[PDB]
Amino acid sequence: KVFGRCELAAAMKRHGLDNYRGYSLGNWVCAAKFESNFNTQATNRNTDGSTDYGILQINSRWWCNDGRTPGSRNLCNIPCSALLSSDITASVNCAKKIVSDGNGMNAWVAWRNRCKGTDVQAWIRGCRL
Numbered sequence: 493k494v495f496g497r498c499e500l501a502a503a504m505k506r507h508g509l510d511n512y513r514g515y516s517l518g519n520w521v522c523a524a525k526f527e528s529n530f531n532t533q534a535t536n537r538n539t540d541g542s543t544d545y546g547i548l549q550i551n552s553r554w555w556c557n558d559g560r561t562p563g564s565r566n567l568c569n570i571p572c573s574a575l576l577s578s579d580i581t582a583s584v585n586c587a588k589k590i591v592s593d594g595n596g597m598n599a600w601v602a603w604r605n606r607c608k609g610t611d612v613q614a615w616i617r618g619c620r621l
Contacts, residue, residue, distance in 0.1 A: 493578045495530045495547070497521060498619035505621055507584040513591050517621075518612035519603065523548060525615070526602035532583075533576045546575035547583045548600065555586055 495503070501521050504510070510517040527549040528534035536544040542553040542561045552561040556572035568586035575583050590599050597603045 493532045495524075495532070497525075497530070497615065498621070500524055500530055500547075501616045501619050501621055503580060504584065507581065509584060509587075512588060513596065515591065515597055516612065518615035519597060519607060521615035522607035522610070522612045523597065523600050523603040526606045527600060532578055532580065535576070543572065545572045546577075547580050548587050549602075550575050550583065550586050550590070555590065 501517055504520050505517055509515075509520045524530055524547055527544075528547050530547070532547050534544075534546065534549065536549060538544065538551070540553065542551050542564070543558055544551055545556065545558075550556055550568070550572070552558040552564055552572050554565045555568045556570050556575060557564065557566040558572040568582075568589055570582055570586060575586065591597055593599060597608070
């Protein structure tokens, strides 16, 4: 599934992401936009051999198990296929342990480089939230 902007924000919102660890909802929506461009099935292979999966492109090296990332850690205790699901429940949760790590949202290169310091508020403008 390819979410609509207001539709992704409603759902992220529903799942406790608005101001989760002080990151307002537009950060999360922006992050989503530039990482998967709102596609729950976006996958991307990295140089190191690891893969980015889903709406927020969670990496297999640390957070999920994909059967093909040697000395991968599976921190969110999930098979990475659960992150490509229509229901972003597993992606939000797994992202909550990520953001909590130490680098806030700097964990997502796309946020750092295209969201960070921008009017991330424009991402939820017009949404009946």
